[PDB]
């Protein structure tokens, strides 16, 4: 009996298949989150600066109140 190297292909490994595809981001939907984070960013920040004004006037009031200084 002769024994040589046997042939096997099975699945053929798929000859040239695309793996690159669009994922997560679509296009217009990313701008809704992108610019949406900006509008949420300013509104949250400016409310803190209005709360800073409560401290600001109260800080300068200490100088006016102190005349024996």
């Amino acid at each position: 009996x002769x024994x040589x190297x046997x042939x096997x292909x099975x699945x053929x490994x798929x000859x040239x298949x695309x793996x690159x595809x669009x994922x997560x981001x679509x296009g217009y939907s990313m701008f809704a989150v992108g610019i949406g984070a900006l509008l949420f960013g300013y509104w949250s920040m400016m409310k803190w600066n209005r709360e800073r004004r409560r401290l600001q006037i109260e800080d300068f009031e200490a100088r006016i109140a102190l005349m024996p200084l």
Binding site: X13, X14, X17, X18, X19, X20
Partner: protein, 54 residues
């Protein structure tokens, strides 16, 4: 396992902005003067003439 391994490079190098910035438009030679150098593999095969030895 090879088909996924080679396709890992395409999602790494070809899709990126860097390669579309760097390698794009360097020595665009495809004319009869490009044929007057004789590269056989790639170059002429890579761009222009549909000739191949295979």
């Amino acid at each position: 396992n090879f088909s996924l391994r080679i396709d890992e490079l395409e999602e790494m190098l070809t899709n990126n902005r860097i390669w579309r910035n760097r390698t794009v438009d360097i020595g665009i030679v495809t004319a009869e003067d490009a044929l007057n150098y004789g590269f056989s593999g790639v170059m002429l095969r890579g761009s222009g003439i549909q000739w191949d030895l295979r």
